Design a protein around this ligand. Structure first.
Ligand SMILES: CCCCCCCCCCCCCCCCCC(=O)OC[C@H](COP(=O)([O-])OCC(O)COP(=O)([O-])OC[C@@H](COC(=O)CCCCCCCCCCCCCCCCC)OC(=O)CCCCCCCCCCCCCCCCC)OC(=O)CCCCCCCCCCCCCCCCC
Ligand SMILES: CCCCCCCCCCCCCCCCCC(=O)OC[C@H](COP(=O)([O-])OCC(O)COP(=O)([O-])OC[C@@H](COC(=O)CCCCCCCCCCCCCCCCC)OC(=O)CCCCCCCCCCCCCCCCC)OC(=O)CCCCCCCCCCCCCCCCC
Ligand SMILES: CCCCCCCCCCCCCCCC(=O)OC[C@H](COP(=O)(O)OCCN)OC(=O)CCCCCCCCCCCCCCC
Ligand SMILES: CCCCCCCCCCCCCCCC(=O)OC[C@H](COP(=O)(O)OCCN)OC(=O)CCCCCCCCCCCCCCC
Ligand SMILES: CCCCCCCCCCCCCCCC(=O)OC[C@H](COP(=O)(O)OCCN)OC(=O)CCCCCCCCCCCCCCC
Ligand code: HEM
Lengths: 431, 126, 110, 352, 352, 126
């Protein structure tokens, strides 16, 4: 359904959809925040926020274009939403504003204003957004002293060393033709986008990007960011999960869906088909949990992230969640797997084919940057339907059963016991 | 321990049948008169052991006037049996007054628990 | 909640042995109390297994202790275990009392 | 009973039954919120637990949504099992149990959580105050239930009988074959629903201008203006909202939010300025009101708001199809003003 | 430093140091309430526990009352120990500790209790609303601290240094030998207080008319009208308040309360109609405003209001000595309106 | 058990006397250096046993930055003595850093409790 073609310097990937009323043209680079040091960290975030500058966005809004960017760990995108008949203007803006004439966004008193903006923004993140910085500290300890631990937001003390030379060095090292995929979603045809890229000479640069000397290695550890003036106690907890283009990728997503997510105040999330709720609903152990399967190019995390005000019964919540995790290795039933297949099919169908062509562009650029081709959703649903109970048990015995966990928590986590007592729950004594 | 759905099933089969009703209902009326819980100011739906989640659910869903009346009958029976006496025959529970008020709540919470169990133990036909 | 917390007796074993919050910085002098419990279990068990053979009359006390030391199978083990475990009971008891005297474990709460 | 669908070659279908039964038609304050929370509870045949645990194996979820005007009952699912969800939405609309234990255990704790969530945000409080002082008893009803008037179970049942009627709702399915959808809406309980009148009034909703309200709040301080707009002047305030949101406007740093709410008879342009200290909010909204009373040229924002309105409009089921071509100039006339927060340091209406 | 006393042949004297330092002169919201709760705490010399445990054995108590204008420090005692209480009020005014552990442990919980109690009553909530929309930043300051702006310990020390000044207070002893009181106030710390300026302005408080506020409240429903009055028109609204409170009016069965708050430069006449259901409040206050806009003959209530004014006026130390003789007729003009409670069924200002 | 007001009284008498100062102050400085609590990162007012209501009062009345810093010094000393090492020589508490920070709060709560007891046991002179 989607067409990818490698033109003479650059990779053009389009996903046409003639039912849509917008069209997004962008370029996705394959250097997210895993291509940083711990000292220039946040320079991808500064590049995002100077692509979304006021001086730069006024030029788009006069033409009728919308600017959207996104910073992930592997990739980063710079996508320009427009109307379907106005995509030559999108390519002209993406060419002039961001690729060629790059030294006008990087003027002083635009760099200074944006640096103050993301300093305020990252500090506002670090003081107020507690589940997401707990996932960030989970990455920072699960992958410590390795590329995949650097926060995509950037720290407050590495964003204060940053000058214009650092953004220029990140640009000349990572914004390359062998590193980019120019992406078109919405209702633009594949011949149309590649013709408009062959028409105006669209070249980023010619180099090859710096190879990271160390691959991402999971180190079982914990960080314990306790703060007793906070009302809840947020805690993420995860094992090393499967990377992208693993064979056990969809099995990892399925096993994340076996225990699903939860909201204790939505009365239809109470009635779900998860056996963990029979434990955690009686004394109201938590307010919400959600099991994720984060997959990156090198490694990834499989775990669950939760929040609770029942700060004296954290150990029952952790114990019951992990004794439910052992059931994947030993006694996962069939209807749990069929329920997880139906719900993972619904989740993946809502995720990939939603209404927004920006999110489709980010997903398309990531999947054809890492794999070189985007897997369609029919083949993905065939792969999900191929998963049996023995596949889930074998993946759980490989990845979950008696393996090193990574924990992270802030708030009132005095009720959280130490590492060895929690890691003793990853394997039971066969009862 | 016996489910109230089972008691209602057996009792409805006995009551709907014309032979079994005329054979077993007078014996049950004499059994209830000899049991003598009405001599302490009690209906039978107070006598049920309330220490299970089905009965606790039923007593939670019971409305407030029935709850206060049931509470008064229980404290009255405790004071009466403390004094080792009976209630005066003007204060006994009449037969028309011994109506099952807690039985629909019990049966509804029981059907909800049995549905919950059957859905926890399904096997999808694949 | 867990069965080790919800039960009647396992909540006691849990709140005394399994989840009992000790400070992180205590040292091997805090092992003598558990060691005194071990000494008491040793003394009581070897005492019962010798009381099955001991006779308390004044003509049979010493003769019955020597019957334990000679005729009873592994009775020398039980008798020397009882006697030297009583000496070790009092060694570890003096260490428990002296670490209490030293680290101020007698003051206002305790 | 107006049924529509828009087919697509994808895998996920979303059915949506939209009833004109939001807070605007609420008889008591918050009865629409209690019915919206009462929607996917147990029916007379299938329980609420059986609905979730059957639809999870079939592969779709449910979501009842309360708007200012609509109650939207949405079902998102795998495409090949449409009639289960048509019949499920039919059972929800036709035969709900409405049990008192269901009111006191799930619906009222859920509504208390919803009111607590909306109470902690001062912008939602300012928007509800702005609605209630622009429109008094029509669209200015309370959105959520708070309990300042007792709404009993028979009130929720009576509102369900008033609202769930056959000329009051409209079935719309994104990524649904319309022939099979129109066949499956019949031979169901939507054809057995009563044919009550449509509650949509086609007249102008009788606004009031020059009103001002002040709320003391512990937290952030917002000051908000609100302009009731008619049907003819909807497009100009649409391009004004996307103008002040956009980077074309010098007021974009000062403005926390600016949006036009749209209905079939009018609308409300809301502008919110939110900060932590009240001197910042005072200086900001004085500058907004002054530089808007001086006229603005909204001709730059036309091509931008076409795209923004298209992005917003592909999600909704009934587009209004605005013009945006005849909009040239704006000049702020009369407007309603609310001030939530540190209310002794925020400006009043005559100081703006 | 104005010392006055009215001697009597009785056993109990009361001393009152009145500062012009109530909520009207508060710089932030609630500093006056926090200073009032900080009044009889510990000093630099004598603790607060030693104060109570000495004054009980001597035979008198203390009480600090916060008004809309004053802060009254009253002290009630057996007559023959007046210099102790003069020196105790002197120590409280001159040298209070203002300790941070005293702010967190005593003053903030006592003020939170006062605010919770006055929050539970919708009549005091409506009275505060009526003040705050008649006059804005002067008398319409909040009476009590609620925490919507951060009042710190240093702000209480600053407000106390501003307010506890020698030309700002007045010493008044009911049943006190006045020459002895003047000898005891001198040779004390009242004479060593700073001779600052008096905060009493002699101008009119710049009122506003026709304003309307609406506060949602779970419980009772009150509707309140309120008229700011000037110095020439104080007696008429006095005889009006005692007319509507009295049994001469036909509206006394409908009116829950009606009182005139008098100040040295004006007043506010506040009429509250309170009930449980909002339809009774609506019918009652529509009848009140209609039969007040139609004129009333306030001539019969004149001898009655001389009595009630003498009753109310013998307690206070500062009489205003109104006329009550030229008052004949009343006709309701413009007025400010607040509605608290079931606020979607209490009427608005147009419907009155 | 020894009141802090008494320690302050005796120590102020020693410090205000010129002979006792120059005789006993170096003895106390060498005593504090031999005591070795600074090698674990503790100031002395972390060492006072807090399990009494005067110390609980003073610790409630401590400002928050001193409370967080005292919490870190106590946790750091626990981890340091767990590992059976000391802190490195740049992490030792300096002499000018070892200020009595809890002492005015302790002495004020002590004076308040002594005044409260004295007023509990008064005898009015009649
Ligand atoms: C017996 C028994 O308790 O079996 C439970 C245990 C089930 O433990 P599990 O299913 O891994 O733990 C799930 C609980 O929810 C785990 O709940 P939890 O994580 O809250 O419990 C913490 C943990 C901590 O419990 C302890 O280790 C307590 C240590 C006691 C020291 C005194 O509990 C256990 O590990 C249970 C094993 C205790 C074995 C009995 C030890 C004392 C024997 C006398 O079954 C076995 O231990 C089988 C092995 C027995 C081998 C023979 C031993 C005798 C020779
Ligand atoms: C020559 C001695 C070399 C080791 C040494 O430098 O000792 C310094 C050490 C001073 O170390 P510190 O850090 O100032 O205080 C150590 C704390 O006791 C901290 O105690 P800890 O956790 O280091 O345990 C101390 C002691 C703990 O020793 C015990 O608690 C005795 C337990 C005996 C169990 C069997 C009892 C049988 C009946 C009594 C015979 O065990 C050791 O001394 C291990 C040294 C390696 O002195 C000793 O601990 C000698 C203990 C001899 C008994
Ligand atoms: C008062 C204080 C009481 C102190 C009692 C001290 C002695 C108890 C020790 C029991 C060992 C234990 O308790 O072993 C409990 C642990 C639980 O393992 P885990 O949950 O960490 O599992 C982590 C992975 N799931 O089994 C083990 O790992 C095996 C250790 C077995 C060794 C036992 C040796 C027997 C000693 C007998 C001595 C006489 C008594
Ligand atoms: C012998 C094995 C019997 C079955 C074990 C089992 O099956 O373990 C199940 C239970 C725990 O169940 P739970 O707490 O996970 O929750 C129950 C609902 N799912 O283990 C236990 O009794 C606790 C083990 C602790 C024992 C400590 C003993 C110390 C005294 C010496
Ligand atoms: C001679 C020696 C014999 C020793 C036997 C001791 C065990 C008791 C048998 C119980 C039988 C039963 O019926 O136990 C069943 C109950 C069920 O538990 P429940 O009611 O919580 O759940 C009911 C669900 N509604 O408890 C158990 O599972 C007990 C299992 C753990 C046993 C605890 C181990 C002993 C700890 C003792 C602590 C000592 C403190 C005393 C101080 C002086
Ligand atoms: C509190 C723990 C105990 C202590 C400290 C203790 C101490 C002693 C000592 C010191 C002896 C003399 C040993 C020798 O020198 O031969 C002794 C003897 C004995 N104890 Fe105990 N005892 C204890 C518990 C028990 C109990 C509970 C019993 C009985 C069930 C018991 C039964 C005996 C017997 C029978 C002897 C006889 C001589 C021998 O066989 O050693 N003891 N005890």
């Amino acid at each position: 359904a989607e067409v990818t073609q490698l033109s003479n310097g650059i990779v053009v990937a389009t996903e046409h959809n003639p039912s849509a009323h917008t069209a997004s043209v962008g370029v996705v680079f394959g250097s997210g925040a895993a291509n940083e040091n711990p000292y220039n960290n946040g320079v991808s975030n500064l590049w995002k926020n100077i692509f979304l500058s006021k001086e730069n966005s006024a030029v788009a809004a006069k033409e009728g274009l919308a600017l959207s960017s996104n910073i992930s760990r592997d990739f980063q995108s710079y996508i320009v939403s427009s109307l379907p008949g106005s995509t030559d203007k999108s390519l002209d803006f993406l060419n002039q504003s961001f690729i060629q004439q790059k030294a006008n966004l990087l003027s002083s008193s635009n760099f200074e204003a944006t640096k103050k903006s993301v300093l305020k923004q990252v500090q506002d993140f670090e003081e107020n957004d507690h589940p997401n910085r707990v996932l960030e500290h989970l990455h920072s300890t699960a992958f410590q002293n390795t590329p995949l631990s650097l926060p995509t937001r950037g720290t407050l003390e590495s964003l204060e060393n940053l000058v214009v030379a650092d953004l220029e060095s990140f640009a000349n090292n990572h914004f390359l033709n062998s590193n980019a995929v120019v992406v078109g979603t919405g209702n633009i045809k594949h011949e149309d986008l590649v013709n408009s890229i062959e028409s105006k000479n669209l070249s980023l640069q010619t180099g090859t990007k710096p190879v990271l000397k160390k691959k991402a290695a999971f180190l079982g550890s914990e960080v314990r960011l306790r703060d007793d003036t906070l009302p809840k106690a947020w805690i993420s907890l995860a094992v090393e999960g499967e990377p992208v283009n693993s064979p056990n990728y969809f099995v990892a997503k399925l096993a994340a869906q076996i225990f699903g997510s939860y909201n204790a105040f939505e009365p239809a999330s109470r009635l779900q088909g998860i056996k963990l709720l029979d434990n955690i609903q009686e004394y109201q152990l938590c307010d919400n949990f959600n099991h994720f399967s984060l997959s990156y190019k090198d490694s990834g995390l499989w775990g669950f992230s939760t929040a609770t005000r029942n700060v004296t019964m954290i150990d029952d919540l952790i114990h019951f969640t992990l004794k439910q995790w052992n059931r994947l290795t030993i006694s996962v039933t069939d209807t749990e797997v069929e329920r997880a297949k139906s719900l993972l099919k619904l989740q993946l169908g809502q995720l990939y084919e939603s209404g927004n062509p920006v999110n489709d562009a980010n997903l398309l650029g990531a999947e054809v940057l890492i794999k070189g081709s985007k897997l369609s959703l029919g083949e993905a649903f065939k792969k999900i339907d191929a998963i049996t109970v023995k596949d889930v048990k074998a993946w759980a015995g490989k990845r979950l059963w008696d393996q090193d966990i990574a924990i992270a928590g802030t708030g009132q986590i005095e009720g959280l016991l130490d590492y060895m007592r929690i890691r003793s729950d990853m394997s039971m004594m066969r009862w | 321990p016996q489910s109230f759905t089972s008691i209602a099933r057996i009792g409805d089969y006995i009551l709907k049948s014309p032979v079994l009703s005329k054979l077993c209902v007078p014996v049950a009326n004499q059994f209830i008169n000899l049991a003598g819980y009405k001599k302490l100011g009690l209906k039978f739906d107070d006598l049920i052991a309330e220490e299970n989640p089905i009965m606790q659910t039923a007593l939670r869903r019971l409305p407030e006037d029935e709850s206060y009346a049931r509470a008064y009958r229980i404290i009255r029976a405790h004071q009466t049996e403390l004094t080792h006496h009976l209630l005066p025959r003007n204060e006994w529970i009449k037969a028309q007054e011994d109506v099952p008020y807690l039985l629909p709540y019990i049966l509804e919470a029981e059907a909800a628990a049995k549905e919950k169990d059957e859905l926890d133990n399904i096997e999808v036909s694949k | 909640m867990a069965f080790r917390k919800s039960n009647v007796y396992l909540s006691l074993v849990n709140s005394y042995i399994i989840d009992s919050p000790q400070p992180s910085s205590i040292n091997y002098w805090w092992n003598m109390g558990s060691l005194l419990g071990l000494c008491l279990v040793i003394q009581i068990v070897t005492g019962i297994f010798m009381a099955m053979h001991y006779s308390s009359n004044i003509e049979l006390a010493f003769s019955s202790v020597e019957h334990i030391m000679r005729d009873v199978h592994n009775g020398y083990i039980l008798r020397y275990l009882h006697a030297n475990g009583a000496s070790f009971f009092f060694m570890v008891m003096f260490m428990h009392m002296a670490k209490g005297l030293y680290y101020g474990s007698y003051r206002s709460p305790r | 009973l107006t049924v529509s669908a828009r087919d697509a070659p994808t895998k996920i279908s979303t059915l949506a039954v939209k009833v004109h039964g939001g807070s605007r038609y609420a008889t008591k304050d918050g009865v629409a919120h209690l019915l919206n929370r009462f929607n996917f509870q147990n029916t007379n045949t299938r329980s609420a637990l059986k609905l979730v645990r059957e639809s999870e194996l079939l592969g779709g979820t449910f979501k009842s949504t309360l708007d200012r005007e609509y109650i939207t009952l949405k079902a998102t699912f795998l495409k090949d099992d449409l009639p289960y969800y048509v019949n499920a939405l039919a059972d929800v609309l036709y035969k709900t149990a409405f049990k008192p234990h269901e009111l006191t255990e799930s619906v009222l704790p859920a509504a208390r959580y919803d009111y607590a969530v909306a109470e902690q945000c001062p912008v939602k409080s300012a928007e509800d105050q702005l609605y209630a002082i622009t429109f008094r008893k029509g669209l200015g009803n309370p959105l959520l239930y708070d309990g300042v008037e007792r709404v009993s179970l028979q009130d929720i049942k009576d509102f369900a009988d008033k609202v769930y009627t056959k000329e009051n709702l409209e079935v719309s399915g994104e990524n649904v074959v319309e022939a099979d959808l129109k066949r499956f809406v019949d031979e169901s309980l939507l054809s057995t629903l009563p044919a009550g009148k449509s509650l949509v009034s086609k007249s102008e909703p009788k606004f009031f201008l020059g009103e001002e309200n002040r709320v003391r709040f512990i937290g952030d301080s917002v000051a908000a203006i609100g302009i009731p707009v008619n049907k003819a002047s909807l497009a100009q305030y649409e391009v004004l909202a996307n103008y002040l949101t956009s980077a074309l406007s010098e007021l974009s740093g000062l403005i926390s939010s600016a949006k036009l709410d749209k209905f079939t008879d009018g609308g409300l342009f809301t502008l919110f300025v939110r900060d932590q200290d009240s001197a910042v909010v005072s200086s900001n909204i004085k500058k907004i009101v002054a530089d808007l009373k001086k006229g603005k040229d909204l001709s730059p924002a036309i091509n931008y708001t076409k795209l923004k309105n298209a992005v917003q409009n592909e999600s909704v089921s009934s587009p209004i199809e605005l013009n945006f071509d005849a909009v040239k100039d704006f000049k702020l006339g009369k407007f309603n003003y609310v001030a939530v927060g540190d209310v002794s340091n925020l400006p009043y209406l005559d100081e703006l």
